[PDB]
Structures are given as C-alpha cells and as structure tokens.
Amino acid sequence: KIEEGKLVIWINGDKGYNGLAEVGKKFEKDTGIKVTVEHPDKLEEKFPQVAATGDGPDIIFWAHDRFGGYAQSGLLAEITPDKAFQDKLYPFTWDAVRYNGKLIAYPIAVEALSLIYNKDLLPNPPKTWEEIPALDKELKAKGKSALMFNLQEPYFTWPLIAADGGYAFKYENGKYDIKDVGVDNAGAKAGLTFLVDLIKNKHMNADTDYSIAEAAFNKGETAMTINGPWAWSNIDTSKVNYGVTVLPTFKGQPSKPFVGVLSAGINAASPNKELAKEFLENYLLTDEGLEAVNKDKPLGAVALKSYEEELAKDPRIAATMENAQKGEIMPNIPQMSAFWYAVRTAVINAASGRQTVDEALKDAQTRITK
Incomplete structure (x- = not known):
C-alpha cells in the first residue's frame, strides 16, 4: 500500500x-x-x-x-x-x-469574518466602529442592542485589535519574522482599549460567547453580529432578513480578520x-x-x-x-500556538478588569517572543 x-x-x-x-x-x-x-x-x-x-x-x-x-x-x-x-x-x-x-x-x-446585520432593525450598517456606542443607545430605547459577538476567542476580537496596526508576526517574503510580533503596539492598544470601553460602558457584556451572540441575532434581539460563512445556514432558518457586508473601520483603518x-x-x-x-x-x-x-x-x-x-x-x-x-x-508557523493562548488571556484579562490594557498586552507580547 x-x-x-x-x-x-x-x-x-x-x-x-x-x-x-x-x-x-x-x-x-x-x-x-x-x-x-x-x-x-x-x-x-x-x-x-x-x-x-x-x-x-x-x-x-x-x-x-x-x-x-x-x-x-x-x-x-x-x-x-x-x-x-x-x-x-x-x-x-x-x-x-x-x-x-x-x-x-x-x-x-x-x-474571513464579515459584519452580519438585521435589515429590519438597521437600514444601513455602520461604516465605523466609532459610531456603534451611539447606535446602541438608540436601539436600547426600543429594547434592542446594536451588536453582539463572541468576545471569548481572539479569532473574533482580532479584527478590531489589529485594525489600527496590530499583527501576529511580521511577514515580508514568504517568511515570517518570529521576533516581530505586533500585539503590544499602539495599534493593538488603541483597538483593545476601544473594546474594553464597550464593555464598561455596557454596550457589550464581557461574558458574550459564540452561543449567546448567535441566539441573540437569530431571535432578532440584536442588530448585528460578526460571524463567518459557516453561520449562514442557521440565520436562514431563523427567518431574519439579514445582509452580509464589509466590517467597520477603526481610526479610519479597515478591520483585519484572519483569513x-x-x-x-x-x-x-x-x-x-x-x-x-x-x-x-x-x-x-x-x-x-x-x-x-x-x-x-x-x-x-x-x-x-x-x-x-x-x-x-x-x-x-x-x-x-x-x-x-x-x-x-x-x-502557518508553530509559534502561532503561543499567540492563541497569550492573546486569549490578554483579552479576557483586560475585559474583566483583572489587568489594564497596557499590562495585558505587554505580558502577551512577552510570552510570544519568549
């Protein structure tokens, strides 16, 4: 054989x-x-x-x-x-x-992840992350929230964290420089800070996971979600009149989902x-x-x-x-395993107040380039 x-x-x-x-x-x-x-x-x-x-x-x-x-x-x-x-x-x-x-x-x-929205609650999706807080206050007036997505896994939060400058490993020639990590730069710092502000300003709950955000969108309780193509069949069933579009920009920069x-x-x-x-x-x-x-x-x-x-x-x-x-x-390198665990921890920590943004990311950066 x-x-x-x-x-x-x-x-x-x-x-x-x-x-x-x-x-x-x-x-x-x-x-x-x-x-x-x-x-x-x-x-x-x-x-x-x-x-x-x-x-x-x-x-x-x-x-x-x-x-x-x-x-x-x-x-x-x-x-x-x-x-x-x-x-x-x-x-x-x-x-x-x-x-x-x-x-x-x-x-x-x-x-890649995309912005999924309820066409019946939201005429036009927001073009910016910066306008979500305001939108959430308007939707809250009717008992609805603006957005709910999985906050637990970095795969889902990375688009925002990376938007203004974050990256896992610098790539520049079919090769990854494993000592060039971008989780502690100002870029990532700006992003995580915005996220944290969402949770503390109660526009988002720190315990939202995959299941919770999914049920919420499918029940028409929230106007938007962040999900991938694998989630479409579930929405169809739900009978929600949904649209899929480009993720919002942050500091005028495109969201950067992993591909x-x-x-x-x-x-x-x-x-x-x-x-x-x-x-x-x-x-x-x-x-x-x-x-x-x-x-x-x-x-x-x-x-x-x-x-x-x-x-x-x-x-x-x-x-x-x-x-x-x-x-x-x-x-596609082995050091990516370090990134998953480190960044996973940094976000849950910063989100739960257990550590500051500056602290949470400084640590993660440390464990990756360790």
Missing part, C-alpha cells in the same frame, strides 16, 4: 466530496486513471502519522494553517505552477501556501505527483471543477478569479472576499 497509477484524495466530510468525486470521474475519462475520494475522521491528525511512514493519500485538502507543521516535517511536495497558472488566482492567496519561501499547496477557497484558505497539498511520498498537479491545475482549478464541487457543498469565496466573479453575484460571497482581502493571512 503506497499508491501508484491512481489518485487517492482526502477531504473533510463537511465539504463537497461528492462534487470532487465528479471532477474525478471526468479525469478518469480522459486518462483512465481512477481517482478515489475519502473523508476519514480527524484526517488532519491521521495525515501526519501515515505520511511519516510514506503512506496516506496523494493529495490532502485542509485549511492552510495546518500545512506549516506538515511542511516542517517534509510531508508535502514542493509545487511549481508556472507564472501563467499563478495569475489565475488572487495574489494574496499564494501567500497562504508558502512555507519559508517554498510553495507547498494550491489555494482553493477563502474564509483561512482551503488548500490542496501533494504527499511528498506520492509516486503520482505529475498526475496530482494535472488533476489539480487542469480539472479542479477550473470554472467547471469548482462548480461541480460547489454544487455539492458551497465553497464560499474561491481563489480562482474567474469563478469568484460568478460567485460574487451573491453579495454575502462578495463581502467575504472583500473582508478577506483586507484581513491578515493566519501565520
């Missing part, structure tokens, strides 16, 4: 693997090479294990952030799309699949790399390939410019892409 003359692909069960299996039938038609799609349990855990022994699938699909650790252990083949193929995708997407200068995967789909990129990487151990690259570049990364997959399960915004332009007729998808273009690609 170690491939040879066929293709085996691994993709999560929550994706359009039936559509991907259909691109595969088309490939098997003009080639005779059979493609096999599977969606094993915790495949992102299983991958590292089987690949380390020269086993596993030829190709694996997962968010880009996980690819950094895989690449580190030499589990992924270096890819070499030519200039021409490269120009078919949004430039920023190639930055997500670079591991110390080397291209280690093809970008497929893009995901996750659904990526396809080739097993360094596969004997079929040429077959993989041909399947990927000429079957899958085409309007017809993305379409067959999308038909099975939506991909959200896609990296292929041509198909994205078709998809963007859905204003929710257009907004997703817009936010993503203004966001921060999530670093």
Whole structure:
C-alpha cells in the first residue's frame, strides 16, 4: 500500500466530496486513471502519522494553517505552477501556501469574518466602529442592542485589535519574522482599549460567547453580529432578513480578520505527483471543477478569479472576499500556538478588569517572543 497509477484524495466530510468525486470521474475519462475520494475522521491528525511512514493519500485538502507543521516535517511536495497558472488566482492567496519561501499547496477557497446585520432593525450598517456606542443607545430605547459577538476567542476580537496596526508576526517574503510580533503596539492598544470601553460602558457584556451572540441575532434581539460563512445556514432558518457586508473601520483603518484558505497539498511520498498537479491545475482549478464541487457543498469565496466573479453575484460571497482581502493571512508557523493562548488571556484579562490594557498586552507580547 503506497499508491501508484491512481489518485487517492482526502477531504473533510463537511465539504463537497461528492462534487470532487465528479471532477474525478471526468479525469478518469480522459486518462483512465481512477481517482478515489475519502473523508476519514480527524484526517488532519491521521495525515501526519501515515505520511511519516510514506503512506496516506496523494493529495490532502485542509485549511492552510495546518500545512506549516506538515511542511516542517517534509510531508508535502514542493509545487511549481508556472507564472501563467499563478495569475489565475488572487495574489494574496499564494501567500497562504508558502512555507519559508517554498510553495507547498494550491489555494482553493477563502474564509474571513464579515459584519452580519438585521435589515429590519438597521437600514444601513455602520461604516465605523466609532459610531456603534451611539447606535446602541438608540436601539436600547426600543429594547434592542446594536451588536453582539463572541468576545471569548481572539479569532473574533482580532479584527478590531489589529485594525489600527496590530499583527501576529511580521511577514515580508514568504517568511515570517518570529521576533516581530505586533500585539503590544499602539495599534493593538488603541483597538483593545476601544473594546474594553464597550464593555464598561455596557454596550457589550464581557461574558458574550459564540452561543449567546448567535441566539441573540437569530431571535432578532440584536442588530448585528460578526460571524463567518459557516453561520449562514442557521440565520436562514431563523427567518431574519439579514445582509452580509464589509466590517467597520477603526481610526479610519479597515478591520483585519484572519483569513483561512482551503488548500490542496501533494504527499511528498506520492509516486503520482505529475498526475496530482494535472488533476489539480487542469480539472479542479477550473470554472467547471469548482462548480461541480460547489454544487455539492458551497465553497464560499474561491481563489480562482474567474469563478469568484460568478460567485460574487451573491453579495454575502462578495463581502467575504472583500473582508478577506483586507484581513491578515493566519501565520502557518508553530509559534502561532503561543499567540492563541497569550492573546486569549490578554483579552479576557483586560475585559474583566483583572489587568489594564497596557499590562495585558505587554505580558502577551512577552510570552510570544519568549
């Protein structure tokens, strides 16, 4: 068991693997090479294990952030799309699949948080974070609040914290400078301070989590929420007349949500790399390939410019892409684990009064660059 003359692909069960299996039938038609799609349990855990022994699938699909650790252990083949193929995708997407200068995967789909609002409570969404407090006082007059989102996890608060200058790790060449951390600058300080002021001025509760904000928006109790494409199906059900738009600016700067990129990487151990690259570049990364997959399960915004332009007729998808273009690609390096825990702590601490903003961030900065 170690491939040879066929293709085996691994993709999560929550994706359009039936559509991907259909691109595969088309490939098997003009080639005779059979493609096999599977969606094993915790495949992102299983991958590292089987690949380390020269086993596993030829190709694996997962968010880009996980690819950094895989690449580190030499589990992924270096890819070499030519200039021409490269120009078919949004430039920023190639930055997500670079591991110390080397291209280690093809970008497929893009995901980023967006501002979700209730069209019945709010005519036009606010363009600015600075105007939320005032809006909240007007909505409170009717027993409604302006905004509710998950305050517990930094993934959700980062857009605001980063807006005016924060960043996880300085990136400038397909490479991340791990001693250039941006959680303690004035930028991040301005952002967290604004957030803290929201909670103390009672425009927001420090204990709002994922579940609470979600139920609140879905019950029409709050005018806005911050969430991703995975949340749409729940709102639909709710029967709320919602819109998806660009996040608000802060100090005139765009909010900077982290961007996750659904990526396809080739097993360094596969004997079929040429077959993989041909399947990927000429079957899958085409309007017809993305379409067959999308038909099975939506991909959200896609990296292929041509198909994205078709998809963007859905204003929710257009907004997703817009936010993503203004966001921060999530670093694929191992030091990112330090960032999660540190920044998680800094925010809960500053929010609960347990520490000041200056203190909370100084500490987090310290634990990351430690």
